[PDB]
Subunit: 499 residues, 4 copies
Amino acid sequence: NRDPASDQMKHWKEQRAAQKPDVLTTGGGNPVGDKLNSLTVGPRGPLLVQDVVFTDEMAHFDRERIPERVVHAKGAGAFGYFEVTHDITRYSKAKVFEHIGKRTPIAVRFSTVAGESGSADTVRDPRGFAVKFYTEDGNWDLVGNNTPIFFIRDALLFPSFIHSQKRNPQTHLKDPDMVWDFWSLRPESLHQVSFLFSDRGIPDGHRHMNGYGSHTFKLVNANGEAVYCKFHYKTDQGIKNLSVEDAARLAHEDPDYGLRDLFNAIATGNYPSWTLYIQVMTFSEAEIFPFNPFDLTKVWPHGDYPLIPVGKLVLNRNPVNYFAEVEQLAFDPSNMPPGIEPSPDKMLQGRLFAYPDTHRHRLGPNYLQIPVNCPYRARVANYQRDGPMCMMDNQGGAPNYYPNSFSAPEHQPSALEHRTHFSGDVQRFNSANDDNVTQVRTFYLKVLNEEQRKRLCENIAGHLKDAQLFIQKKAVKNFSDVHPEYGSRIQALLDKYNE
Amino acid sequence: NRDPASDQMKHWKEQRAAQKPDVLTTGGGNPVGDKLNSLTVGPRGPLLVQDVVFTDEMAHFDRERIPERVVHAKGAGAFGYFEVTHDITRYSKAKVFEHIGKRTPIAVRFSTVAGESGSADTVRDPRGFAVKFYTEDGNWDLVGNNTPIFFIRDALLFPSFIHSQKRNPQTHLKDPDMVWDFWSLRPESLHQVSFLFSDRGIPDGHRHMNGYGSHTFKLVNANGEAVYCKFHYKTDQGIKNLSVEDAARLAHEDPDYGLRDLFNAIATGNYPSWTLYIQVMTFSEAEIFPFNPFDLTKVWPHGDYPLIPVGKLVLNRNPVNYFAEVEQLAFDPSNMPPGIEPSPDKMLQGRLFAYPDTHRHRLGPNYLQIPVNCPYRARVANYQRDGPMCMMDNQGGAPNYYPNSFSAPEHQPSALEHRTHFSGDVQRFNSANDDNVTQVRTFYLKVLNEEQRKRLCENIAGHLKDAQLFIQKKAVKNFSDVHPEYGSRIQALLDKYNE
Amino acid sequence: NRDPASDQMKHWKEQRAAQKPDVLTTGGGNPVGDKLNSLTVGPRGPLLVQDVVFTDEMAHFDRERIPERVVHAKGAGAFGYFEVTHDITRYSKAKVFEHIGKRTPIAVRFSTVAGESGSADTVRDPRGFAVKFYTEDGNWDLVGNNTPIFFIRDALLFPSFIHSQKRNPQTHLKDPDMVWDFWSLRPESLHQVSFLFSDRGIPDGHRHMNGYGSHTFKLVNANGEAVYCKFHYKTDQGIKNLSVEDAARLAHEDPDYGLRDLFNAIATGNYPSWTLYIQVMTFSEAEIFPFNPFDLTKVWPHGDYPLIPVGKLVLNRNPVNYFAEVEQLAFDPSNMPPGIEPSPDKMLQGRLFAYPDTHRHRLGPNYLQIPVNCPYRARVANYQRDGPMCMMDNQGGAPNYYPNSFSAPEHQPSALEHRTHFSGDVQRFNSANDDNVTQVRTFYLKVLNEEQRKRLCENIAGHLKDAQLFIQKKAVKNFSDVHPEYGSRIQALLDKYNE
Amino acid sequence: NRDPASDQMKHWKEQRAAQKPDVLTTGGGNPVGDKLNSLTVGPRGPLLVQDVVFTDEMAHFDRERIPERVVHAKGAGAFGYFEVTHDITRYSKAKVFEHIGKRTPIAVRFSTVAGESGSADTVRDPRGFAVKFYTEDGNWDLVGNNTPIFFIRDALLFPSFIHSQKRNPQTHLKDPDMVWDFWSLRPESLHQVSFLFSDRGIPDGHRHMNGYGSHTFKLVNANGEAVYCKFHYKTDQGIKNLSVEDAARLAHEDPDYGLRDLFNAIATGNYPSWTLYIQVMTFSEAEIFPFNPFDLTKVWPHGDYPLIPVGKLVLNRNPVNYFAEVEQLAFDPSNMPPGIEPSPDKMLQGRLFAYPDTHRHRLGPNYLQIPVNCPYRARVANYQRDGPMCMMDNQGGAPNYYPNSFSAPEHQPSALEHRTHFSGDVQRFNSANDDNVTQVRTFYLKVLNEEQRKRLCENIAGHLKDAQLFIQKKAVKNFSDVHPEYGSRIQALLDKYNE
Ligand code: HEM
């Protein structure tokens, strides 16, 4: 007897023993008479096109694959619910927060960032932690990571950052000179790079890590009053990490470690859960905040902005068909119910467009009619019609133009947005020189102990040693700009690694 | 008060008078507060990305269109049922003929051939008359025309023929030189051409024309015995045609004449219905038949192969959304249930590959998961998985391979195909010289009368006159090869049209 | 002999009389030995899969079609050059205006609006008139119509308007109730509706109509000084229209009238040409302008803003292949070279997204690598990589991220945008009741004469009569609000039409 | 200084030091003035739509990915030439074998089978060895593996075999039960499984393994005479293998080991090469051969059918952009020049369809117009037109139908296929019980030595122990059917592994 994942088929049969097997058909419902031998003219003769049983099956086999996600391609998924435990109705009128005890169906997808579909799970990388809330106001996607910050703060650098984290365009190899040339030319990355080369850069699966919206968002209550917030969801199973040596063994021992962990957990009843907190900032506090409160490379410290609890995320169901329910999951930061809205965070302003854009490419123009993506607890009605692979009644014979004298859907004025005043030149403002070291200094000195600082440097040096010396020299300098002992330790190790 | 088609929105509003209008939402189910005005900075300022209401609506509008059909693009649709009235179980075991009184749902498409989506209905053309039977053993797609025959008899000429009947690739205009250079270089077209330019070239809407499967097909009964057959469905409303004069007036007074006629008939309860017949040829009649009995340019004469009634087709329901239910309809001649099998007709052997093929391009790899296309009266079960726009549970966690020791679906030996014996070289055989005139001579002399022959010639000369002289000279010789006076009449009228 | 279009194939053969015909191949370059007869076992036997010549040719015929344009689907194309004849470098620094005498290649596509691929040319509808300039600074797409104004002034209403002008979702029939329910609930349409039912609603081919940029745009000279502008290109062949009586004859006698008139002109050396003008409005004239200067239902009167000439548009070359050079044409308003920039027109702003969006769907992710869409007089170099159907070297092994230390492309600071100050609430501002009648009154009284006013009203009532009475009454009211005699005339004609 | 692969960017900058960096443009050729900061309203404001520099680049990033190969996804590419060295023109007329010394440009792709794009290179799996010859008669794709044989012999079992070799449809994990349930239910796989689990299951990269075409193919000479042949291309660098211990270290130390080993070799002039041999079986010897000569699970022994040399394959060029030259590479077995034809092999017959079919999905309808797929040594001319992403003239204004009297391409009769006689019932013949053991027994006893048999069983037991007991027992039985001591040794080690 083995773990539950290995016994998948065994249980599919047992859960079925009472029935007779189904009749094996074509895609058109036509029963198949023999599907092990091809129609040929004679035992050693050629194949006929009259063999449409072969063409039907092969034709579909040939179209099985769709594009993998451009980022966060290697993923695990699970489904559960969100349950409200505390009252934050003064801040948000979102129905998903309406009363204590309110449950809402969720779907979660964990991921790495850089590796493709066949890569290993226990590698150094940020982790995705995307959560979709099926509310009565339409879906709410909270596309968060295992970290509160990112490496950049303008969306126009993002394709570049990703390119520098993936394969060299000629050799198709991971290229340290690309990784570090970028990071050293963009020191705003220093904060998240210090998180990444810490211990938490390799979590022991998906259940022992925290999630964060990382972005500043906006909450609007019933009076029309607004505050800015951060979301934190913290692991009730406790932070737990793999060491470098153990992560490396599992990388070839079990490439799908974090997939198998999550599936087995839920199957054995160990339902992982997370505690949803927010931080709140008023509009006033936002004007006096020392840094840019919409700079994704900055946290809101806890002492000044403590955590307010909201509710629990619980995962208690495994997917049944991985493709249908995880590969085809699509999270849009732009899916926001009334009560939740976006900040002016440059990076989040780019994500408002990019996600729906790529989903119409990766999955298709009507990807929101796929079941896991459908807002199935909301009544979807508008003037949008047709498109490839239209799957409902296409809203029937309703008038498809607005306004109209024939009683099709109407706009709901109470769902209008919060009005904010802005003034300034319409212009590309340079955010490369916002504070890039202060919060990092704090992390290095007051969050890490001495042993962790030591490991931080060894993990950095073990990867940076493969870059050229002019890149090393520049990266080390950025590290000295945080703390001279941060830089001179790294440089002591590189001096050895360089023989 | 007007015809019922014009009152569609009027009635749509009346059937809703009681309830309230729906909440107008995004495709994500998020209610919109205002959808007549965009999100801008100040009344005369620029448009914001934050306006995800606009993006969501505009983006879908931008994706409304799919590739029209490559032929038969102008279409009208309706729905109904097939009812058995006579017993032909001695020839076929197809569940759709199981017993008298048995109904099966059907869906029909009427079309022209050459015109694109906006072309007129009342033009000289063949008419598609495609019928989809939703049976228990999967779907059965009788994809016929309003002719028993076609212009050619080898599929390799089909892309060519169609190119010649569409727009010149530089000027994008209808070209008579193309049209008649082909027809006169392939005189196998004489038989169908004669049909086209007579009175039935322009039927008075789709309810006053017959439908034929034109190919020879194979029926198989419960003992394993097989016969060949032809399908005829004859209009119970009576053949009725339009004059060249009236067809040309309506071509600009109502380009959608046939579409309108069908909708209004059904809406006022005047339901159209056809009578399905079959002809039956034994295998040993097929060896002694004077022509090639699988020649798609040949009919089976009635005197020797009389019509055997089978039942009624009845259209009694209009589509609710034309796009979802008519435009996305996909018919595959290779959708054949046990009891119905292909002949060796070279032209039908091509259509077994072409239709599924083009449907994966026009509609999508999983187009059979579109409702109106679905085999909703059978159980689809097999080892096909994934593909873009997967719309069911993707078959669940069922074992995806075959054979297996876990009781996934099994093959049904009774559904094997009938086995024929064939012997001969594997090579390309020349069919350009099968009897191209005999059955036409009969049509011209014995079926048509004096006035119809006169009109047949006028209609041909009135379109052949715009081709070059060397092309007219050749066409006329092919016509002369049917009957001297056939050519003589056309050539006398051409001598006049050429001033 | 016949017109030059009809003789296209004749001339192709003549231009090749001297050579031998090419060898006919598969798409893989494998010569074909027979393509009229299919590979079969015996003369009357089944088709084989081994017949890759059939499948290679049938596979591509099955994928011949692409989605037609969602609007303006029916179009005609030609190519030529733009030439500067006057100096407007004090307003715009764009390299297409640099000096008198400079020539830039162009590509033009004329079109109707609503009719699909097969509809008639000679119908009442606006006419598209899009102009692609191939600049050294990249492409410039002046996507114009044959009117200065449009029916609506907010992009959100654009799907609706179109839906109302196209087919009823259930009957697939042009619906008068949809047309006028919309127009009568949105009286901003009054201006362009009076343009459309006037003599210029049906132009006599594409050479006898003007072209307008319609939108206000922004020009920026070398000093950084900016003005607002309007592009008018006026036919050098003279305004010429068709009467309702003749347009309806041709609509069935020659559906492709405009397409034939443009090819035949060019082929016979009668090259059509236009004269490009601008209006100019300083930022300070924009502030005092009585209406909203960015309202697309409004014109700038000539007395206050006279026409300034710029150059000539000349069309002097037909397409060689219509699909590759016309059907696949893609104009993006957003393609704007330094010195030409958008105004805050709500409609234009919307079009900045729409066109690239739909072109990725209609043509594909890399649609700008199609030769006719290529900026083949600039040097494209950036950090975009891959995609479906990637056709060049994909920019080689160049570093693919930015910034980088390995000398891949750099930004050009002189090509930054003009900076404008905006201030206001971010909200949805209601423009429904900007002045809707003033400039229409002027048109009805001062531009048309007695006869033309008569025909304008007969054309409006000849179409509005089919709508319901409550829709009629409302429209007429909207027409009275322009002038009592406007709506009263229409109402007198409607009274007769309603028997 | 480092290896060449890591100095890629270093050498790109050096090879450019003379010139100045290009101007960074949009896709449309428009220079950008700042691509590090986004267009906003005030420094902490929201993002505008008229930031088309952002949109244009993100929209393409969002569409960088295409579908991965449905098998053999992980790959490494190189280009070179094929040079004839011996005269086989008595067997084949193919222009690639015309004379000694004749060179042809080639392109080769190496791969594994079951891992996705991200997986490691040093795992136990077959290896792809696909060769594209660009001959004057079009392209010749020889789609070969590093084995003479394969696991199955009917293509209707392919999708299933591949499903079992990949991931569980619910857990997304590698599932030994699926692996061995399939293999133990289809003992035909015994031959190739004993190859897979010997030392050659893991090659030391791609330069130290042989190539084979596995399938019997047909050769046809200038006289029309045919023979059946096998292609073997052996490594001039020598067979060399990784041990299980080192293959696993490298699977985490360098996932891309085989890719780097090829690139560094070519870059340093150590060009790998292969020797091309054929075996030859006359049609007479094919009637008396002891097994089925077209049984993909059978080799032709060397004693009876010796290797006949042909020429060399040499890889002396790396790719410059991996995506454009290696990921978009498409190989079709059906690309076969005159002189080379398929044999009736049931598995090859299915590859004649499957590959073009998946290539139209994976890449697109016109994937043969992608440079590296272009038959650029041959002249493509025919009657195929249009399609998504049509990239050349589209063959201009040339007549698009055949036959025609206007001098478009003609068929070449000498390119016709060899005619073979076939006689037999058209049915599905069982091939499950062709001799499944005999050649395996020879391998085990006569090809392997003592040590190698021991490791063969250890490799097998290490993997089979994770399957259920009932699957183990059945697999061992199939190994006892080869040789009692084969099944014995495996059962003694499974007894230990099961504690
Ligand atoms: C402007 C900056 C960014 C851009 C342009 C961007 C772009 C993308 C794209 C195109 C995808 C693919 C989505 C799909 O295929 O369905 C994706 C996935 C994802 N992104 Fe980002 N991203 C950005 C920053 C971020 C940030 C700040 C976070 C978290 C705070 C994040 C978290 C994720 C996650 C978790 C996924 C995987 C979603 C899934 O499992 O389907 N990304 N991103």
